[PDB]
Amino acid sequence: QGASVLFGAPGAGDIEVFTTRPDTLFGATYMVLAPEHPLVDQLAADVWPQDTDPRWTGGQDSPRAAIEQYRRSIAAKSDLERQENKEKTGVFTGAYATNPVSGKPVPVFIADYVLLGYGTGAIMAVPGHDQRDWDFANTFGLPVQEVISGGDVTKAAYTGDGVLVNSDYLDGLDIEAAKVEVTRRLVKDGRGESR
């Protein structure tokens, strides 16, 4: 029903996520990793790229500084404290992963509501069609992309039924067919499997 999805990160191997909505993969506009994720240190960019939003930096000079300050601000928090967090916190790593189907860049964030041990340690965020993502995106200014017609993503995530849009060669497909097509492409390209 769902899918495991591998996002390529330059020079650092793969970031694995699990999603129940592989059909929304063209709508993934960012990734969120657990702050303790083993790849975070390698992903940290030398400088903030020009597309960095000042709400993503913690006010720090560099990705490394933002990451180590964030890690310290959350080190004491319990694991339910983190996962049910009503406040959205996080920082940008500077890094971009490759969308395994569309090939587009996906900025990589860390945030304490993602935890090691309770899942893959990374999620793919589709704010257009996942309310939790919509709220996190809303506080930081992350992009919000509609890929399922039928709602209004400027106001809230659309979790209902509709056909695919803004999804290249998936355009017009039913959600159930798009789920399979994305899974089969991942399998064929060695970038995931059904789960």
Numbering used by the authors: 304 to 498
Please give the exact wording used by the authors of the publication that reports this structure:
Leucyl-tRNA synthetases (LeuRSs) are examples of aaRSs that rely on their editing domains to limit misaminoacylation of tRNA with near-cognate amino acids and maintain the fidelity of the genetic code. Here, we identified epetraborole (EPT) from the MMV pandemic response box as an inhibitor against the essential protein leucyl-tRNA synthetase (LeuRS) in M. abscessus. Benzoxaboroles were shown to inhibit LeuRS in fungi, gram-negative pathogens and most recently M. tuberculosis. To gain insight into the interactions between EPT and LeuRS, we solved the crystal structure of the M. abscessus editing domain (LeuRS303-498).
